[PDB]
């Protein structure tokens, strides 16, 4: 009855939420896995036992345990991304927003959140699925996953804590979406998984993992690709950070068993507290517990994989933001501050660059500097500012995504690539951060639509246009109902995404990425 | 009497040559040193014994012995640079073109010719001093110097063949100009030495050598700087090529004495014939016998010198051509030919680049390639063509001159820098060579003025404007009688020199030269 749905798991009773003009249906916090609490910490997810009775789904699920950003207490620019519902280890839920009246077989969109893998919430205001569900008559689902130690501790030979437990969770949510969205109006043969930052890299990892390939039709990856430097660790490395976390908690490090026992008994927050003390370097845009390349979730090396077309060949829509580095500078590099134009001194610049390319030796920092320095204005603090933003950005987001697109289009069935370069008229962050990494998500979810959030009409415009590109691609495999060119290894077309009449451009940051993708690596191996 | 001049050497009787409208005086082939023939081969020059009688100076001197370019037999584009008077070891003469009526104290210009140090003639048609002498009322002198083995064999510890014998000759001509141009109408306190390619590097070497500093007021260096890679060899290296030449002639290599004896007895042409067989590599823009850094002509390392302001601080006017590489590609790299658009294959490109950076190891060729390749069009033959032209050019001419300007302006008394990018409407070379290295000289000498050579009115325009910039600077230290900015380490202004209303630009090839001048070198030393 509109709101009471029978799924193979059991009966679920939704809620009717208001949206712009109309009203819609929302099913909140539906279990999809069993609570990964108790002895189940670090363990791969188990599917949720079927329930009897009606599952009430009118209130959002708890957020998974995670790092809460206290840096700008009260600042929405920073709070907008923190858990907004009680954190709990019992957090694997999913949310569905259904058009009303309920469709019969309509495109499904599965949002997968970012947070560098140590944070994320499917309940944040900017991820509110209703303007999209309503505007585009699409079934929107937003899954949850275990982030941090909890979701990514990798003690490789063990069943108690192998890697990618949080990716497996992503997958279980996908399986359930697979198995019951038909009961909601969703066409299971046309679910597009979309995501940002670790959300986007995870999407890319499901396109790559044989286990996930079959559970989704196509993908959208925004500001992330699975080959990002900060998106996966070798199992060795994962082992290392695992025991090291072990140390910070004065655990018995004799056996994995011993180790896992300990961690298994620490209160959640105790893991959260020492989580940043195991990284091997002083670096910006490096996360501690992230997907491990184990040989199960990933058969081989992501490079060998991309290289051999050993991946789902579907059609993907992807892109980047103009100022991807900013956030990471702001919080990690000396010289940048929220309340000043953060003009950086070469002293600061040089420390900055060391932070960004943590693995680069001296000759390596030398090459980075050569490439990103003005030479006729080498102490111009704005320039030093901006070029560091370009480093963190190209290095961590633009170049790996351009490498992923380039390999992938050799065997995919269509590629659409954009470049988002629109600064919300209401951004609360310093203009110097520019088009901030994560600032497209609001367009994608059509916030510029709610008149009380203060956007401009031309942004309401764009949000509408963005949402339609995203839904039309989702259901059709092409963003086009003017023409958004297809990425082609030949010509390499892409479009800027902003409030002006669309321009098609070519070879996104080619000069720069030949440096990161080809020159640097070669240099770094003698 | 107009044409009979008494110089401290003796009486000289000139000739009256026609020029545009008027007529002028020309004193041709005045001895300034004793014939470096016989046992005097390779030996530093001796000043010319004073003569009695009137030295007849109405016919051009012989050209020094040198390599004659047979590549395009009959082609003027190539013949225009070959000896046009009989070659002879007795070749150290000087030519003077005096306004008429004879001035009383007027600016003197001393042209010093290029030819990569193995060739050159002061008698070539394009070096004909009369349009300049006449247009600008300037005393123009064109000296001669020993090129090749003859002028540059460096057996370091010996008096029979130390290096830079051909530079010492440059200097002797300078001394005489110093001592007698007053007798011609020349103001000895204002002689500007100008030169191109090795002509320009030699100029730069007189600014650097304590011995020469005092003999000239200011300088013009066009397409050359003494720090060019092909402009000087270590004495070790000079030694090496010296004996090696020794071998090709089946000489007794036991002692320098032994060695020098041999060479001293070979007919000139025998040296010319094996001259190219001693270079240590397969390379484009590398000459065999060139100035040696001996510790006499050059106290220390040119770098230590530039570095410490250990040089004449006067005001210099310098610049480059747009297509400096072409000539060297055409003749040295596989794929380029006079009669085809020489589109190059990566196969050819890669051999090309190995030729250009002969000292670069593999990682070095890798860095060069990274920098000069399109990456989105890496087999576009035009692009491969053009980028190789950019390599040979930046590497061998633009970057060293930009390093020289930059160090020098730290202690000079004015710098003027241009960028010549005008393709003579009548060039006989393939359009793909562009603005060829040596193609400004005709503007500088006002050929575009003679109506029978077929230039355009706008080139007559430019030649006039070029000649005036050159003479006004010569006599005044500033090219300006609109404003041609002064090169300043700060802003780095320069002007394009072509038939259009002058544009001031900044930082000539900065991106590229940070590569050659700073990045490459660092890489090449582990």
From Swiss-Prot, chains A, B:
It comes from the Eukaryota. Changing residue 422 to Q: Almost no loss of activity. Pfam families: COesterase. Its EC number is 3.1.1.7. GO terms for biological process: acetylcholine catabolic process in synaptic cleft; choline metabolic process. Keywords: Cell membrane, Disulfide bond, Glycoprotein, GPI-anchor, Hydrolase, Lipoprotein, Membrane, Neurotransmitter degradation, Serine esterase, Signal, Synapse. Gene3D superfamilies: alpha/beta hydrolase (3.40.50.1820). The keyword Membrane applies. Glycans are attached at residues 56, 413, 454, 525. InterPro entries: AB_hydrolase_fold, AChE-related_enzymes, Acylcholinesterase_fish/snake, CarbesteraseB, Carboxylesterase_B_AS, Carboxylesterase_B_CS, Cholinesterase. GO terms for cellular component: extracellular space; plasma membrane; side of membrane; synapse; synaptic cleft. PROSITE patterns: CARBOXYLESTERASE_B_1, CARBOXYLESTERASE_B_2. Inhibited by substrate concentrations above 0.5 mM. Disulfide bonds join 64-91, 251-262, 399-513. One of its GO terms (molecular function) is acetylcholinesterase activity. It is an enzyme of class 3 (hydrolase). Found in the synapses and to a lower extent in extrajunctional areas of muscle and nerve, and on erythrocyte membranes. Terminates signal transduction at the neuromuscular junction by rapid hydrolysis of the acetylcholine released into the synaptic cleft. May be involved in cell-cell interactions. PANTHER family: ACETYLCHOLINESTERASE. Belongs to the type-B carboxylesterase/lipase family. Isoform H form is a homodimer; the asymmetric form is a disulfide-bonded oligomer composed of a collagenic subunit (Q) and a variable number of T catalytic subunits. This is Acetylcholinesterase. It comes from Tetronarce californica. The gene is ache.
